[PDB]
Symmetry: none
Subunit: 207 residues, 2 copies
Amino acid sequence: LPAGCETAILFPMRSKKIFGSVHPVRPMRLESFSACIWVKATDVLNKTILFSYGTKRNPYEIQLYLSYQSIVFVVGGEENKLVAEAMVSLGRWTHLCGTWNSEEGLTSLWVNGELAATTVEMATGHIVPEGGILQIGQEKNGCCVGGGFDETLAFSGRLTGFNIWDSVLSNEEIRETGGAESCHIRGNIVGWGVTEIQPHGGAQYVS
Amino acid sequence: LPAGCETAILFPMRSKKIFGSVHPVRPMRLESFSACIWVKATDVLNKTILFSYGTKRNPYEIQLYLSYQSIVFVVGGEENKLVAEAMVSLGRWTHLCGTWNSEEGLTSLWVNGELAATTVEMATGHIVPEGGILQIGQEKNGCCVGGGFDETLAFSGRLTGFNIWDSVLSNEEIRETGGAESCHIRGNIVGWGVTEIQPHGGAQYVS
């Protein structure tokens, strides 16, 4: 387990059926936010969508994915994105965090409690609309067609601590969530064990 | 049997899952086209979506929906439509059919094989996109989610003789399709009993 957790998803095999359905309880109102996460990637491709919140008219409303030895940060749509280079590789628990603002379009990334990317005037004044759904480990593809889901974009590996925050996280708290006692640090939008998480098609906890 | 047909589909109750899955054989890419049908208007609400063909970027590519007394026929989008006034019935096998072209934006509607309405230079040059889903008996929405199909948009009743053509039908052919010897003339785009049709969510085949 990454730092002090005892539970983690297993994702033993990426196939055309592995996915999950999360049903958060509270609104997604966000003109700014931050999202720490610990990840253990087994294989990284040019395109492998770890998750993406999508609306009926904007499936790419939120998304981040690893492009070989790089990390992509998609906001709002495919066109608007931020990328850092050569930080994520196969098989190691690594803390990923970031921040965004709509006032002057400020956004940033924080790995291991340490900066990874930053820019300004992106998604300035943007507000995420509701009505979409957040999906983990898969992109929009067939589910019950004897497979269907893109095994290419599917994921295999260990994950734990699915959390989301309603506002920006200070650099101090980002560092703390990058520390060895980050398992108990959870956000309010989503908290591990607090938010409804429904693995499917292979994603197994290792509690 | 009406129109000489030998099979039909019953929509016994307007419900949030009642619909049918239609998969026409050939592409829908047409400029001048026509399609006629017999409808037994069981319920005529202020809005009872008869069907809805929609592409991802345009939910209202093609949509015929029935109002209290008017057959509102939408082409391309909500902006362009063709509408009748006081000649739609309740609980009676009735004929409604329309044509369209992009050359000069021609369009028409045909009740009981008799012309109903028409306008010119409507969507001139427009080409209907292909590859979309031809949802029937209900405006496109979720079914497996559990309900999803707004019952107001849902329709109930018996349906027979589904036909789609690749050209504007002549007046003589419209009269022929409006008679008791109209079952045999079935559309090449879709022919009653040719294109696979699966009533679902309460609907069943009937004859």
